[PDB]
Short mmCIF file of C-alpha atoms and ligand atoms in Angstrom, two decimals:
data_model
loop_
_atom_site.label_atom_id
_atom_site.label_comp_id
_atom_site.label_asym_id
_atom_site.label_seq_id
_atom_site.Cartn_x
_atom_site.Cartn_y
_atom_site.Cartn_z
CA UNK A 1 101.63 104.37 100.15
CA UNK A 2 101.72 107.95 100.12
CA UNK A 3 98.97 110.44 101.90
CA UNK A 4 97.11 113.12 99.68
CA UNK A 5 99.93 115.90 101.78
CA UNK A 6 102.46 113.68 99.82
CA UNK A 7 101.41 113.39 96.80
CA UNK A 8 100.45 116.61 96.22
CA UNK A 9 104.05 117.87 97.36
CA UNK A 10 105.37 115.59 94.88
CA UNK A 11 103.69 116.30 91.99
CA UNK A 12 103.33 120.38 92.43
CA UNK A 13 107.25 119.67 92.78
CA UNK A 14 107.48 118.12 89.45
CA UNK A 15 104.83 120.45 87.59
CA UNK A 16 106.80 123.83 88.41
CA UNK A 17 110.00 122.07 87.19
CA UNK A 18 108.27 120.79 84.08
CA UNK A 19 106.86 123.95 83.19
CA UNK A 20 110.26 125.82 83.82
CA UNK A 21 112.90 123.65 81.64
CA UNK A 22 110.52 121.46 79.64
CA UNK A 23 108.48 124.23 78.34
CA UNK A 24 109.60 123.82 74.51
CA UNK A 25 109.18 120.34 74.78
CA UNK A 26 105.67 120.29 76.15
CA UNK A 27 105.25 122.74 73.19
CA UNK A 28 106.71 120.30 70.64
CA UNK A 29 104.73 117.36 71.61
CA UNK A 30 101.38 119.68 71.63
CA UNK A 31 102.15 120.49 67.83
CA UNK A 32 102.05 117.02 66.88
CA UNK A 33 99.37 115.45 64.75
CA UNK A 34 98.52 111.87 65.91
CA UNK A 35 96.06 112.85 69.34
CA UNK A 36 96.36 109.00 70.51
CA UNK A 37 100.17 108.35 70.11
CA UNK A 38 102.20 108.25 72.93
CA UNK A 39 105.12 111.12 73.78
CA UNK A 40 107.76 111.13 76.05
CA UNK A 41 109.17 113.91 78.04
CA UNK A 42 112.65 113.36 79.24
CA UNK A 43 113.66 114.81 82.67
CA UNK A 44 117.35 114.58 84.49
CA UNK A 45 116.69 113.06 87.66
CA UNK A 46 119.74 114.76 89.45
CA UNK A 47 118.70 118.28 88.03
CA UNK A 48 115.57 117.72 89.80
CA UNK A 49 116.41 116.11 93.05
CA UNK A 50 118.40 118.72 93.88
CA UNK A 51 115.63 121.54 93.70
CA UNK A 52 114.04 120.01 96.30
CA UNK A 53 115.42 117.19 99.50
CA UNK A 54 111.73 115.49 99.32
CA UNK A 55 111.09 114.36 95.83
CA UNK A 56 114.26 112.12 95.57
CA UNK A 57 113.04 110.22 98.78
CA UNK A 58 109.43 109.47 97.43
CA UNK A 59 110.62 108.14 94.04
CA UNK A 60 113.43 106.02 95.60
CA UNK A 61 110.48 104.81 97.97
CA UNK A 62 107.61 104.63 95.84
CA UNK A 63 108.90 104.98 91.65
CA UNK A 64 105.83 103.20 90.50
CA UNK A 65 103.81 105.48 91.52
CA UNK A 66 105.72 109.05 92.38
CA UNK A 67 106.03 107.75 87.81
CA UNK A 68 102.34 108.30 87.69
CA UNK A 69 102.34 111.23 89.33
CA UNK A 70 104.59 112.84 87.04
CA UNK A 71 102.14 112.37 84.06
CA UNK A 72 99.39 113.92 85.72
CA UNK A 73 101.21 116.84 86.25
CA UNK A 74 102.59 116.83 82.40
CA UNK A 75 99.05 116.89 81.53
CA UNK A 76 98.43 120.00 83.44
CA UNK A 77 101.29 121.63 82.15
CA UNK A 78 100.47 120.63 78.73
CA UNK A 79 97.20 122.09 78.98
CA UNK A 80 98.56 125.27 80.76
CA UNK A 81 100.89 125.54 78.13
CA UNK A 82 98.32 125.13 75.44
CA UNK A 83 95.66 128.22 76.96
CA UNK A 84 98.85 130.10 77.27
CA UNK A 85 99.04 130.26 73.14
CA UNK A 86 96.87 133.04 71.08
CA UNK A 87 95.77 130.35 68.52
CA UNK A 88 95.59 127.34 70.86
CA UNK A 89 93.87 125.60 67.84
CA UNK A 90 96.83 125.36 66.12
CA UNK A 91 97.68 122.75 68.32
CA UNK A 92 95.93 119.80 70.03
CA UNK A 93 95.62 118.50 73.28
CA UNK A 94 97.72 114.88 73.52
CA UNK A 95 96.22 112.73 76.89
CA UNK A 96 99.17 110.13 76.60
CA UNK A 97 102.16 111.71 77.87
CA UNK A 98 104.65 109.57 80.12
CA UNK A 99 107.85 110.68 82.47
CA UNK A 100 110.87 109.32 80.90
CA UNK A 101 113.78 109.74 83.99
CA UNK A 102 117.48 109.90 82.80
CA UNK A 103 120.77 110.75 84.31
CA UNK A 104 120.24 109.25 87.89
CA UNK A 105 122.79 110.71 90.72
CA UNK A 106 126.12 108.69 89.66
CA UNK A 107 126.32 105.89 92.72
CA UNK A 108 127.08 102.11 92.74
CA UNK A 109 123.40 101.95 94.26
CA UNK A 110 121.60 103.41 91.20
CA UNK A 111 123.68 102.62 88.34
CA UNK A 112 124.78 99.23 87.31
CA UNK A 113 126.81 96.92 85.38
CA UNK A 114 125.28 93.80 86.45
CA UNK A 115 122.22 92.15 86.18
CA UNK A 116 119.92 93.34 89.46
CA UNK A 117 119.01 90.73 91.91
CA UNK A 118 116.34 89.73 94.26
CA UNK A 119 117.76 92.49 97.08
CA UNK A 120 117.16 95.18 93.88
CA UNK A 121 113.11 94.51 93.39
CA UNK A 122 111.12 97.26 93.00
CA UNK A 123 114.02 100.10 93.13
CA UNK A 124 114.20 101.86 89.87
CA UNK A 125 117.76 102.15 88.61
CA UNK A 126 119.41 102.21 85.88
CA UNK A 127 121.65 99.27 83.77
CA UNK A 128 123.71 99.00 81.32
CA UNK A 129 124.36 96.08 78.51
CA UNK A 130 124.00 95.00 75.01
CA UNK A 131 120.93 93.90 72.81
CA UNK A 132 121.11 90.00 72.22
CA UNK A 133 117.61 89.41 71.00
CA UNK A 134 114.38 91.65 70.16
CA UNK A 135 110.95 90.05 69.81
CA UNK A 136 108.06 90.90 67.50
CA UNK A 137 105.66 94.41 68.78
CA UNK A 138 102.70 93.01 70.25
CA UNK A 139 99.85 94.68 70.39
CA UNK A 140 97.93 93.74 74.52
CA UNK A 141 95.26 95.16 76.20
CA UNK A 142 95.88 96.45 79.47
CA UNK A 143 92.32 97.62 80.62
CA UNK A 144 88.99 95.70 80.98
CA UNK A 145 85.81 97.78 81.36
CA UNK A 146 82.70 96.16 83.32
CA UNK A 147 79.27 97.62 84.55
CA UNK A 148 77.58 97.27 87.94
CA UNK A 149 74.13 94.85 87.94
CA UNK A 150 72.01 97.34 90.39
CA UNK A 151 74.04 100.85 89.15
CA UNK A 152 74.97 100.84 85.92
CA UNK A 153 78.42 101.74 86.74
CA UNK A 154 81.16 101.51 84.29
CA UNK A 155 84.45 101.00 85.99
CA UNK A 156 87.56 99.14 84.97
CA UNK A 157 90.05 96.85 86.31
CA UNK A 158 93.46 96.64 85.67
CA UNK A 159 95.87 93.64 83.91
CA UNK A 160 98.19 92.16 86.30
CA UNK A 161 102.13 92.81 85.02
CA UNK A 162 103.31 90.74 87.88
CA UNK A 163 101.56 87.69 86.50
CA UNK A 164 102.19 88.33 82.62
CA UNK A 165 99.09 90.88 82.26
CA UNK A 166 96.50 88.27 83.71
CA UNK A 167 93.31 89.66 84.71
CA UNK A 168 91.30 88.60 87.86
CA UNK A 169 87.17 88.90 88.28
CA UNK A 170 86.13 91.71 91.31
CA UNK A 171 83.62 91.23 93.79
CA UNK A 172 83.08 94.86 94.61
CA UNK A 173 81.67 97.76 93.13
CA UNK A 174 84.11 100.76 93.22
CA UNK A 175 81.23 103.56 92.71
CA UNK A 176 80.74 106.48 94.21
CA UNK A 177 77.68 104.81 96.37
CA UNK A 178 78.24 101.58 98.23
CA UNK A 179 76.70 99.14 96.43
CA UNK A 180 76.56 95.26 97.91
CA UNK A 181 76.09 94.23 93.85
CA UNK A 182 78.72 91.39 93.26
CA UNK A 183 77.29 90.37 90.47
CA UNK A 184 79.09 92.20 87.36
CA UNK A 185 79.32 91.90 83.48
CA UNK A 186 82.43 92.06 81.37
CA UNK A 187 82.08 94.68 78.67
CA UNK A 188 85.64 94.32 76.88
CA UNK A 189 84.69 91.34 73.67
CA UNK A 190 81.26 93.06 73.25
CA UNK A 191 82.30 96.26 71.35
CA UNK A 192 85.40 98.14 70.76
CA UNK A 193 84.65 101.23 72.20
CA UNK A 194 88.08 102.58 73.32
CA UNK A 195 91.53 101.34 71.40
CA UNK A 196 92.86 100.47 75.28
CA UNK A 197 95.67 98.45 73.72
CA UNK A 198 99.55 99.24 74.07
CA UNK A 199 102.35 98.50 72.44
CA UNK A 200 104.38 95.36 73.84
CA UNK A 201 107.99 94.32 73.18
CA UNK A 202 110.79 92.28 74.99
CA UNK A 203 114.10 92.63 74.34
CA UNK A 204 116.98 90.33 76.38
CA UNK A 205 120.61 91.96 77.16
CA UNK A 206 123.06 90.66 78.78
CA UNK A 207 126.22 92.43 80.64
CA UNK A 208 129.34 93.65 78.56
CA UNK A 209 132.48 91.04 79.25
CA UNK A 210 134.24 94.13 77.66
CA UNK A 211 133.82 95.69 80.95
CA UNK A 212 136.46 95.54 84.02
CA UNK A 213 133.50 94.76 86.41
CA UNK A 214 131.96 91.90 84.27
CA UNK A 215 133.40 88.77 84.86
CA UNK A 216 133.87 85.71 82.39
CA UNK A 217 130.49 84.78 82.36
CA UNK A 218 127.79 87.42 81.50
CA UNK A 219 124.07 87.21 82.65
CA UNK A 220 121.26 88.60 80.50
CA UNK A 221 118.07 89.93 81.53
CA UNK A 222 114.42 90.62 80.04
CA UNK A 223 112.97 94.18 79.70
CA UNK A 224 110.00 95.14 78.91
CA UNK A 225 108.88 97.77 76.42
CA UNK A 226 105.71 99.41 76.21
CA UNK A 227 104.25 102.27 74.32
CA UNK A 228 106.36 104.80 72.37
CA UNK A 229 109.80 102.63 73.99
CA UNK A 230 109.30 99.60 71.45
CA UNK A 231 111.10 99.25 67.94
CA UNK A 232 113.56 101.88 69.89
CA UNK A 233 116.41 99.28 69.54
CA UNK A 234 117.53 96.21 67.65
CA UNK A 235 120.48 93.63 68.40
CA UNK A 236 123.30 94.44 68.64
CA UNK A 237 123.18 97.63 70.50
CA UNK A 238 124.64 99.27 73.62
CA UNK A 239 122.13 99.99 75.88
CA UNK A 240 121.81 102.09 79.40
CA UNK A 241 117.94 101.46 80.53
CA UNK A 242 116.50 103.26 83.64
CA UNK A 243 113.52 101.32 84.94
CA UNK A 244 111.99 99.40 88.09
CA UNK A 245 113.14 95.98 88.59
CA UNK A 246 110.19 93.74 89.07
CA UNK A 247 109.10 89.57 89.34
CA UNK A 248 107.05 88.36 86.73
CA UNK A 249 105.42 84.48 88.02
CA UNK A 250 103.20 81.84 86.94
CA UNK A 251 102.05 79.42 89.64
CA UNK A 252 102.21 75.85 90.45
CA UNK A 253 99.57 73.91 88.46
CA UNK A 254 98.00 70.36 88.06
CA UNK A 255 100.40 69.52 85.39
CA UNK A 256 102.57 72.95 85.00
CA UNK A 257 105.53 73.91 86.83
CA UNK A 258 106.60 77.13 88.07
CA UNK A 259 107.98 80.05 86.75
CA UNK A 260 109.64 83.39 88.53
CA UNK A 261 111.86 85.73 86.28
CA UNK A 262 113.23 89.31 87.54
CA UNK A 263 112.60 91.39 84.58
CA UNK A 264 113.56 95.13 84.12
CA UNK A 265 110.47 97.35 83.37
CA UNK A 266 111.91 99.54 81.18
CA UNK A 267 111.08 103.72 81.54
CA UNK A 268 113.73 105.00 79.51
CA UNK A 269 115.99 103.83 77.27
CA UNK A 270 120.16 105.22 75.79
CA UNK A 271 121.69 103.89 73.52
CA UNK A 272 125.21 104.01 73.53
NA1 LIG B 1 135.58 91.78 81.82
ZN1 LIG B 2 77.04 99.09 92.09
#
């Protein structure tokens, strides 16, 4: 991964360039009403790449998470932005602000035509097609909260994507003091506390035959949609979607077989 000199680089990059170009938009999403909706902030990659030689490297090494980076420094720019106003009540405060990245450098490596393969997992890139099928939102929870047996601790685990937002059981307790406790209780059917639950939506393309590069077969390809990027298309359309390409599995079982699928987790989407 990347060391605390890294990722503070990387996201005091991002946070000066946000709070320079984006500042209107920051603005815009601050004057909203709905405090738990989700709002995008879109950002050309190439624009910001070129401000500084570092920040390009990191996300082409580490997009899942250079991504999360970049909302933790939206939040401090929103909240910059918002002391910044004489009447910062006029506004309010909105925690759920993601990174959208468009226009990627123009290269055969980063934009595509075809379907990625197996070579492409876990680079974030970019491809274009058209809408065959859209499925039904879906409303999923992502989060699980449990409590320590000896502390008291409330701490939370997160849903596996890889394995089709699975969770697994801890042994550990993640608290500030070392605690040997491995016995823990699950907190999430007992109350509903929080709303942790996002939005969920699939939608299949497949590559344009229209196109000189696509042959006389076309392959499709799942992408996921979560949050405010669901119900932002319907079949039919022409899509460019900039995301990391990732394998979603289900194991072997007694009497189940298999399943692997490369699936394009979607972080912004064009339409054409
Ligand atoms: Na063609
Ligand atoms: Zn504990």
């Amino acid at each position: 991964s990347m060391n605390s000199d890294q990722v503070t680089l990387v996201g005091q990059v991002f946070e000066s360039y946000v709070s320079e170009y984006h500042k209107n938009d920051i603005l815009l999403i601050l004057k909203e009403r709905d405090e738990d909706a989700h709002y995008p902030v879109v950002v050309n990659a190439m624009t910001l790449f070129e401000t500084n030689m570092e920040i390009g490297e990191y996300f082409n090494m580490f997009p899942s998470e250079v991504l999360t980076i970049f909302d933790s420094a939206l939040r401090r720019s929103a909240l910059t932005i918002l002391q910044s106003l004489s009447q910062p009540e006029a506004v309010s405060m909105k925690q759920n602000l993601h990174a959208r990245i468009s226009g990627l450098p123009v290269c055969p490596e980063l934009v595509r035509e075809h379907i990625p393969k197996t070579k492409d997992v876990g680079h974030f890139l970019s491809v274009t097609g058209t809408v065959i099928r859209t499925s039904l939102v879906k409303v999923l929870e992502f989060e699980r909260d449990y409590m320590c047996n000896k502390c008291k601790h409330v701490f939370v685990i997160k849903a596996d994507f890889e394995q089709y937002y699975t969770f697994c059981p801890p042994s550990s307790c993640p608290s500030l003091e070392s605690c040997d406790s491995s016995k823990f209780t699950c907190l999430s059917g007992l109350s509903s506390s929080p709303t942790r639950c996002r939005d969920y939506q699939e939608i299949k393309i497949q590559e344009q035959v229209q196109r000189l590069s696509v042959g006389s077969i076309p392959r499709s390809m799942k992408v996921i949609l979560e949050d405010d990027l669901v119900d932002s298309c319907k079949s039919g359309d022409d899509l460019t979607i900039y995301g990391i390409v990732m394998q979603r599995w289900k194991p072997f079982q007694q009497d189940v077989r298999a399943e692997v699928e490369i699936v394009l987790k979607a972080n912004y989407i064009q339409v054409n």
